[PDB]
Design a protein around this nucleic acid. Structure first.
Length: 218
RNA sequence: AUGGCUGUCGUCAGCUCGUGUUGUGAAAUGUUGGGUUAAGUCCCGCAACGAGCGCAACCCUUAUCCUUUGUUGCCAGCGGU
């Protein structure tokens, strides 16, 4: 769907020479991504999603960037999928035997602090007991009811969330990511070259994948 | 040869483990960093996520008030002396 996008480059001072088949050097010292090679690779990753969304699987979206942080949360609860948006805990997939006891710790007191003994200890306990779920809810809020490990994983910037890509390479979770010209397209399975730090571009990329999973649910 | 008990650094703020990761490995990470605290005290950050022993609080005494009780303790207002 070659439309009026914004993704066309992300600096030419350093790049990533493994990102050589997607290069046009503009005279403003700016790399341009060849978009007519993106859309053969963009639609095939969404074609792999209907292979996976028909399995009644769990799609997990990760990307923070401080610009696409809130953009992935509303585009995941637009569907019934899962997200990590504020900060990605190191070892939330490989060490899920311990992180399971943290999302259980959250919903044990999310059960508690809505009805019962949220005010029956002190005020100074309620000064920090409201603080400790508001520490864990913006680290585990999209993942708290998943109850497993995802069978796909969507990254918005590859070298910014390389910790999440590498954990979905130890075990066979197929990660497919919006990579940039400075990112490294080797840990990603279904590489799609695009824009990682533009708002209207990341809503175009994520509005497509949030569309294709709910129409893919037959 | 030891048990039990005790000194000491020193009431010093430290000492570790599980899992995950990194490294061929001894190991490292966590526990470092930016602040803060009497304190590994707390917060923010961060391939770490958690937990344990300490730290703190819980215990006793002292500092204030109230209630109950009024003797062998007490005397403000009352009578005698």
């Amino acid at each position: 769907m070659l439309k009026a996008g914004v993704h066309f480059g992300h600096q030419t001072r350093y790049w990533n020479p493994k990102m050589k088949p997607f290069i046009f050097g503009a005279r403003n010292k700016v790399h341009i991504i060849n978009l007519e090679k993106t859309v053969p690779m963009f639609n095939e990753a969404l074609a792999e999603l209907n292979k996976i969304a028909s399995r009644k699987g769990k799609i997990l979206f990760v990307g923070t960037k401080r610009a696409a942080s809130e953009a992935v949360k509303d585009a995941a609860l637009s569907c019934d999928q899962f997200f990590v948006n504020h900060r990605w805990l190191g070892g939330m997939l490989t060490n899920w035997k311990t992180v399971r006891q943290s999302i259980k710790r959250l919903k044990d007191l999310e059960t508690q602090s809505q009805d019962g003994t949220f005010d029956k200890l002190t005020k100074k306990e309620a000064l920090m007991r409201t603080r400790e779920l508001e520490k864990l809810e913006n680290s585990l809020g999209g993942i708290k009811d998943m109850g497993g490990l995802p069978d796909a994983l969507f990254v918005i910037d590859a070298d910014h969330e390389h910790i999440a890509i590498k954990e979905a390479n130890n075990l066979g979770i197929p990660v497919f990511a919006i990579v940039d010209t400075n990112s490294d397209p080797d840990g990603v399975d279904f590489v799609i070259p695009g824009n990682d730090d533009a708002i209207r571009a990341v809503t175009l990329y994520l509005g497509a994948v949030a569309a294709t999973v709910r129409e893919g649910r037959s």
